[PDB]
CSV table of C-alpha atoms and ligand atoms in Angstrom, one decimal:
chain,number,residue,atom,x,y,z
A,4,UNK,CA,213.3,176.8,31.9
A,5,UNK,CA,210.9,179.6,32.9
A,6,UNK,CA,207.4,179.5,31.3
A,7,UNK,CA,207.0,183.2,30.3
A,8,UNK,CA,204.0,184.0,28.2
A,9,UNK,CA,202.1,180.7,28.5
A,10,UNK,CA,201.8,180.8,32.3
A,11,UNK,CA,201.6,177.9,34.8
A,12,UNK,CA,198.3,176.2,33.8
A,13,UNK,CA,198.3,173.6,30.9
A,14,UNK,CA,194.9,172.2,29.9
A,15,UNK,CA,195.1,168.4,29.4
A,16,UNK,CA,191.5,167.6,28.8
A,17,UNK,CA,188.0,168.6,29.9
A,18,UNK,CA,188.5,167.6,33.6
A,19,UNK,CA,192.4,167.6,34.0
A,20,UNK,CA,195.3,170.2,33.9
A,21,UNK,CA,198.9,170.5,34.7
A,22,UNK,CA,199.9,173.2,37.2
A,23,UNK,CA,203.6,174.4,37.1
A,24,UNK,CA,205.0,175.5,40.5
A,25,UNK,CA,208.1,177.3,39.7
A,26,UNK,CA,210.6,179.7,41.4
A,27,UNK,CA,210.0,183.3,40.1
A,28,UNK,CA,213.5,183.4,38.4
A,29,UNK,CA,215.6,183.4,41.5
A,30,UNK,CA,219.4,183.8,42.0
A,31,UNK,CA,220.8,182.3,45.2
A,32,UNK,CA,223.7,184.3,46.4
A,33,UNK,CA,225.1,181.8,48.9
A,34,UNK,CA,225.3,178.0,49.1
A,35,UNK,CA,223.1,175.7,51.1
A,36,UNK,CA,220.2,178.1,50.5
A,37,UNK,CA,216.5,177.4,51.0
A,38,UNK,CA,213.9,179.1,48.8
A,39,UNK,CA,210.1,179.0,49.1
A,40,UNK,CA,207.1,180.2,47.1
A,41,UNK,CA,203.3,179.7,47.1
A,42,UNK,CA,200.5,179.1,44.6
A,43,UNK,CA,196.8,179.4,45.3
A,44,UNK,CA,195.0,176.5,43.6
A,45,UNK,CA,193.4,177.9,40.4
A,46,UNK,CA,190.1,176.0,41.3
A,47,UNK,CA,188.2,176.4,44.4
A,48,UNK,CA,186.4,173.0,44.2
A,49,UNK,CA,187.8,169.6,45.2
A,50,UNK,CA,190.5,168.2,42.9
A,51,UNK,CA,193.0,165.2,43.0
A,52,UNK,CA,196.8,165.4,42.6
A,53,UNK,CA,197.6,162.2,40.7
A,54,UNK,CA,201.1,162.8,39.3
A,55,UNK,CA,204.2,164.9,39.9
A,56,UNK,CA,207.0,165.7,37.4
A,57,UNK,CA,210.2,167.4,38.5
A,58,UNK,CA,211.4,170.5,36.6
A,59,UNK,CA,214.8,170.8,38.4
A,60,UNK,CA,218.2,172.0,37.2
A,61,UNK,CA,220.6,169.0,37.2
A,62,UNK,CA,223.4,170.8,39.0
A,63,UNK,CA,222.2,173.5,41.4
A,64,UNK,CA,219.1,171.9,43.0
A,65,UNK,CA,219.9,169.6,46.0
A,66,UNK,CA,216.3,168.8,46.9
A,67,UNK,CA,212.7,170.0,46.4
A,68,UNK,CA,209.7,169.6,48.6
A,69,UNK,CA,206.1,170.3,47.8
A,70,UNK,CA,203.4,171.0,50.5
A,71,UNK,CA,199.7,171.5,50.7
A,72,UNK,CA,198.5,174.1,53.3
A,73,UNK,CA,196.0,176.8,53.9
A,74,UNK,CA,198.4,179.5,55.1
A,75,UNK,CA,201.9,179.7,53.8
A,76,UNK,CA,204.4,181.4,56.0
A,77,UNK,CA,204.9,184.4,53.7
A,78,UNK,CA,202.9,186.2,51.0
A,79,UNK,CA,204.3,187.5,47.8
A,80,UNK,CA,206.9,186.3,45.4
A,81,UNK,CA,209.4,184.1,47.3
A,82,UNK,CA,210.9,183.9,50.9
A,83,UNK,CA,213.8,182.1,52.6
A,84,UNK,CA,212.7,178.9,54.4
A,85,UNK,CA,214.9,176.7,56.5
A,86,UNK,CA,211.7,174.5,56.5
A,87,UNK,CA,209.6,177.4,57.9
A,88,UNK,CA,207.1,176.5,55.2
A,89,UNK,CA,203.6,177.1,56.4
A,90,UNK,CA,202.0,178.8,59.4
A,91,UNK,CA,199.3,176.1,59.6
A,92,UNK,CA,200.2,172.4,59.3
A,93,UNK,CA,202.2,171.7,56.2
A,94,UNK,CA,201.1,168.6,54.4
A,95,UNK,CA,204.0,167.1,52.4
A,96,UNK,CA,202.9,165.7,49.0
A,97,UNK,CA,206.1,165.2,47.2
A,98,UNK,CA,210.0,165.0,47.7
A,99,UNK,CA,212.5,165.1,44.9
A,100,UNK,CA,216.2,164.4,45.8
A,101,UNK,CA,219.2,164.9,43.4
A,102,UNK,CA,220.7,161.5,44.3
A,103,UNK,CA,217.5,159.6,45.0
A,104,UNK,CA,215.0,159.4,42.0
A,105,UNK,CA,211.4,159.6,43.1
A,106,UNK,CA,208.8,156.7,42.8
A,107,UNK,CA,205.5,157.4,41.2
A,108,UNK,CA,202.1,157.2,42.8
A,109,UNK,CA,200.3,154.0,42.2
A,110,UNK,CA,197.5,154.3,39.5
A,111,UNK,CA,194.1,155.1,41.0
A,112,UNK,CA,195.8,157.1,43.9
A,113,UNK,CA,195.6,160.8,44.4
A,114,UNK,CA,195.8,163.4,47.2
A,115,UNK,CA,192.5,165.3,47.6
A,116,UNK,CA,193.1,169.1,47.5
A,117,UNK,CA,190.9,172.3,47.3
A,118,UNK,CA,187.1,172.3,48.2
A,119,UNK,CA,185.9,172.9,51.8
A,120,UNK,CA,188.5,170.8,53.5
A,121,UNK,CA,191.6,170.3,51.2
A,122,UNK,CA,194.6,172.5,50.9
A,123,UNK,CA,194.1,175.9,49.1
A,124,UNK,CA,197.9,176.4,48.5
A,125,UNK,CA,200.9,174.5,47.2
A,126,UNK,CA,204.2,175.6,48.9
A,127,UNK,CA,207.3,174.8,47.1
A,128,UNK,CA,210.6,174.5,48.9
A,129,UNK,CA,213.8,174.3,46.9
A,130,UNK,CA,217.1,173.7,48.5
A,131,UNK,CA,220.1,174.9,46.3
A,132,UNK,CA,223.4,173.2,46.5
A,133,UNK,CA,226.9,174.5,45.4
A,134,UNK,CA,225.5,177.5,43.3
A,135,UNK,CA,228.8,177.4,41.1
A,136,UNK,CA,226.4,177.1,38.1
A,137,UNK,CA,225.3,180.7,38.8
A,138,UNK,CA,228.5,182.6,37.7
A,139,UNK,CA,226.4,183.5,34.6
A,140,UNK,CA,223.9,185.3,36.8
A,141,UNK,CA,221.0,183.4,35.3
A,142,UNK,CA,217.6,183.1,36.7
A,143,UNK,CA,216.3,179.8,38.1
A,144,UNK,CA,212.8,178.6,37.6
A,145,UNK,CA,213.2,175.0,39.1
A,146,UNK,CA,210.1,173.4,40.6
A,147,UNK,CA,207.4,170.7,40.0
A,148,UNK,CA,204.6,170.1,37.5
A,149,UNK,CA,201.5,168.7,39.2
A,150,UNK,CA,198.8,166.7,37.4
A,151,UNK,CA,195.4,167.7,38.8
A,152,UNK,CA,192.0,166.1,38.0
A,153,UNK,CA,188.4,166.5,39.2
A,154,UNK,CA,187.7,162.8,38.5
A,155,UNK,CA,187.3,161.3,41.9
A,156,UNK,CA,190.1,158.8,42.6
A,157,UNK,CA,189.2,155.2,44.0
A,158,UNK,CA,192.2,155.4,46.4
A,159,UNK,CA,193.2,158.5,48.3
A,160,UNK,CA,196.8,159.3,49.3
A,161,UNK,CA,197.5,160.6,52.8
A,162,UNK,CA,200.4,161.1,55.3
A,163,UNK,CA,200.9,159.6,58.7
A,164,UNK,CA,203.5,161.9,60.3
A,165,UNK,CA,205.4,160.7,63.4
A,166,UNK,CA,207.5,163.3,65.1
A,167,UNK,CA,209.4,163.8,68.4
A,168,UNK,CA,208.7,167.0,70.4
A,169,UNK,CA,210.4,166.5,73.7
A,170,UNK,CA,213.9,165.0,72.8
A,171,UNK,CA,216.9,166.4,74.6
A,172,UNK,CA,220.3,165.3,73.4
A,173,UNK,CA,222.9,166.2,76.2
A,174,UNK,CA,226.3,167.3,74.7
A,175,UNK,CA,228.7,164.4,74.1
A,176,UNK,CA,226.0,161.7,74.8
A,177,UNK,CA,226.9,158.6,72.6
A,178,UNK,CA,223.3,157.4,72.1
A,179,UNK,CA,220.0,159.2,72.5
A,180,UNK,CA,216.9,157.5,71.3
A,181,UNK,CA,213.7,159.5,70.4
A,182,UNK,CA,210.7,157.1,70.6
A,183,UNK,CA,207.3,157.7,69.1
A,184,UNK,CA,204.2,155.6,69.4
A,185,UNK,CA,200.4,155.8,68.9
A,186,UNK,CA,197.5,153.4,68.6
A,187,UNK,CA,195.9,153.5,65.2
A,188,UNK,CA,192.1,154.1,65.2
A,189,UNK,CA,191.0,154.6,61.7
A,190,UNK,CA,190.0,152.4,58.8
A,191,UNK,CA,192.9,150.4,57.2
A,192,UNK,CA,195.7,152.3,55.5
A,193,UNK,CA,198.3,150.9,53.1
A,194,UNK,CA,201.8,152.2,53.4
A,195,UNK,CA,203.6,152.5,50.0
A,196,UNK,CA,206.3,155.1,50.7
A,197,UNK,CA,208.2,156.6,53.6
A,198,UNK,CA,210.5,159.6,54.3
A,199,UNK,CA,212.8,160.1,57.1
A,200,UNK,CA,214.1,163.4,58.4
A,201,UNK,CA,216.6,164.6,61.1
A,202,UNK,CA,219.4,167.1,61.2
A,203,UNK,CA,223.1,166.4,61.5
A,204,UNK,CA,223.0,164.4,64.7
A,205,UNK,CA,220.7,161.8,63.4
A,206,UNK,CA,222.1,158.2,62.8
A,207,UNK,CA,219.3,156.0,61.8
A,208,UNK,CA,215.4,156.3,61.6
A,209,UNK,CA,213.1,153.4,61.7
A,210,UNK,CA,209.3,153.0,61.7
A,211,UNK,CA,207.2,149.9,62.5
A,212,UNK,CA,203.8,148.5,62.7
A,213,UNK,CA,203.2,146.6,66.0
A,214,UNK,CA,200.4,144.0,66.0
A,215,UNK,CA,199.9,141.5,68.9
A,216,UNK,CA,203.5,142.2,69.8
A,217,UNK,CA,205.1,141.6,66.4
A,218,UNK,CA,207.2,144.3,64.7
A,219,UNK,CA,206.8,144.7,61.0
A,220,UNK,CA,209.2,147.1,59.2
A,221,UNK,CA,207.7,150.0,57.3
A,222,UNK,CA,211.0,151.8,56.7
A,223,UNK,CA,214.5,152.2,58.1
A,224,UNK,CA,216.9,154.7,56.7
A,225,UNK,CA,220.1,156.8,57.3
A,226,UNK,CA,218.8,160.4,57.5
A,227,UNK,CA,222.1,161.7,56.2
A,228,UNK,CA,221.3,159.9,53.0
A,229,UNK,CA,219.1,161.9,50.5
A,230,UNK,CA,215.8,162.4,52.2
A,231,UNK,CA,213.4,161.3,49.5
A,232,UNK,CA,210.3,159.2,49.7
A,233,UNK,CA,211.5,155.6,49.4
A,234,UNK,CA,209.2,152.7,48.4
A,235,UNK,CA,208.0,150.3,51.1
A,236,UNK,CA,209.6,146.8,50.7
A,237,UNK,CA,206.2,145.3,51.4
A,238,UNK,CA,202.9,147.3,51.3
A,239,UNK,CA,202.1,147.3,54.9
A,240,UNK,CA,198.5,147.6,56.1
A,241,UNK,CA,197.9,149.3,59.3
A,242,UNK,CA,194.5,148.5,60.9
A,243,UNK,CA,192.4,149.5,64.0
A,244,UNK,CA,194.2,148.3,67.2
A,245,UNK,CA,197.6,148.5,65.7
A,246,UNK,CA,200.4,150.5,67.2
A,247,UNK,CA,202.7,152.6,65.1
A,248,UNK,CA,206.2,152.9,66.6
A,249,UNK,CA,209.3,154.9,65.4
A,250,UNK,CA,212.9,155.5,66.7
A,251,UNK,CA,215.4,158.1,65.7
A,252,UNK,CA,218.9,157.3,67.1
A,253,UNK,CA,220.9,160.4,67.9
A,254,UNK,CA,224.3,161.4,69.2
A,255,UNK,CA,225.5,164.5,71.1
A,256,UNK,CA,229.1,164.1,70.0
A,257,UNK,CA,230.4,167.2,68.5
A,258,UNK,CA,228.1,169.4,70.4
A,259,UNK,CA,229.1,171.7,73.4
A,260,UNK,CA,225.5,172.2,74.6
A,261,UNK,CA,222.3,170.2,74.7
A,262,UNK,CA,220.4,169.7,71.5
A,263,UNK,CA,216.5,169.8,71.7
A,264,UNK,CA,213.8,169.7,69.0
A,265,UNK,CA,213.4,172.8,67.0
A,266,UNK,CA,213.2,174.7,63.7
A,267,UNK,CA,216.8,175.6,63.0
A,268,UNK,CA,219.8,173.6,61.6
A,269,UNK,CA,221.4,173.6,65.1
A,270,UNK,CA,218.3,172.0,66.6
A,271,UNK,CA,217.1,168.5,65.9
A,272,UNK,CA,214.1,166.8,64.4
A,273,UNK,CA,212.9,163.2,64.5
A,274,UNK,CA,210.3,163.0,61.6
A,275,UNK,CA,209.0,159.9,59.9
A,276,UNK,CA,206.5,160.5,56.9
A,277,UNK,CA,204.5,157.5,56.2
A,278,UNK,CA,202.8,157.9,52.8
A,279,UNK,CA,199.8,155.6,52.5
A,280,UNK,CA,196.5,155.1,50.5
A,281,UNK,CA,193.0,154.3,51.8
A,282,UNK,CA,189.8,153.4,50.0
A,283,UNK,CA,188.2,156.7,48.9
A,284,UNK,CA,185.0,156.1,51.1
A,285,UNK,CA,187.1,155.5,54.2
A,286,UNK,CA,189.9,157.9,53.6
A,287,UNK,CA,191.4,160.7,55.6
A,288,UNK,CA,194.3,162.8,54.2
A,289,UNK,CA,196.5,163.2,57.3
A,290,UNK,CA,197.2,161.8,60.7
A,291,UNK,CA,199.9,162.8,63.2
A,292,UNK,CA,201.7,161.1,66.1
A,293,UNK,CA,203.7,163.3,68.5
A,294,UNK,CA,203.4,161.0,71.5
A,295,UNK,CA,204.8,157.9,73.1
A,296,UNK,CA,201.9,155.9,74.4
A,297,UNK,CA,203.7,152.5,74.8
A,298,UNK,CA,207.2,153.3,76.0
A,299,UNK,CA,207.9,149.8,77.6
A,300,UNK,CA,207.0,148.2,74.2
A,301,UNK,CA,210.3,149.5,72.8
A,302,UNK,CA,212.2,146.9,74.8
A,303,UNK,CA,211.2,144.4,72.1
A,304,UNK,CA,212.2,146.7,69.2
A,305,UNK,CA,214.3,144.8,66.6
A,306,UNK,CA,218.1,145.3,66.9
A,307,UNK,CA,218.3,146.9,63.4
A,308,UNK,CA,216.8,150.0,64.9
A,309,UNK,CA,219.8,150.5,67.0
A,310,UNK,CA,222.5,149.9,64.4
A,311,UNK,CA,223.1,152.5,61.6
A,312,UNK,CA,222.3,151.4,57.9
B,401,CU,CU1,218.9,169.3,49.8
B,402,CU,CU1,214.2,169.7,60.1
B,403,NA,NA1,213.9,173.4,60.1
B,404,NA,NA1,215.3,149.5,73.7
B,405,NI,NI1,196.6,144.8,52.4
């Protein structure tokens, strides 16, 4: 329920506090609606996000996403966001899915936020489902409770985002692959969770670490299944000289015109969010790959990447 008089900040101890990021009592008028809101961090100095607790209605909320960024798309109370979340790069921290219960951060692991370089804002995206549980006209305050601490964490959580930019899916085309690859050139990262994201043309999304020619599965998922962060089968380290490679399999069947990458439901996306940790003294919070630097390498991609899970 809504917090009313106590507000969104709960003190836990001298150095920690819970921040509740909730909808300002909204009432979705249509189904399949996407709401956004923002919260400036209460603290200017560096803090660590070490836990998330969902505060979702168990009937109306389909999924929730939380981001860190410096400039949310809109100011004010709330806005409608078909994942038009931030104006700068939105750094995903958390996904909650109705049908896919989230996995916790490992102990000792946190995202760095605030300070000179970290996110100054959280942006909450809530996707509402069938909205039949709104005939009472009630106000919804679904969201997330975030556990922040100033105690520096020995391990820092980050995001390696792989995304297609140039994909064109001609109408009626049975199979279109969107391939993404980059050489990794940082200190070692350990992947512990992944999220896949396409729109309605996506069949299967797979991500791999390629080392000396060998393909090691990070994650492989049907993007039409709930788009939560799923744990990695085996914590995969990615080290200097490694190549990260991803493939989204698309279809143009059902479409009368070409589908390219874009920000609407009728466009497509090929996103693979690889959540990792790094040693605190080596850590960087975000890396991005929007390229295909080793296209011929995909000829030895495992067969599982081409058949839907
Ligand atoms: Cu949803
Ligand atoms: Cu999208
Ligand atoms: Na979008
Ligand atoms: Na191939
Ligand atoms: Ni390791």
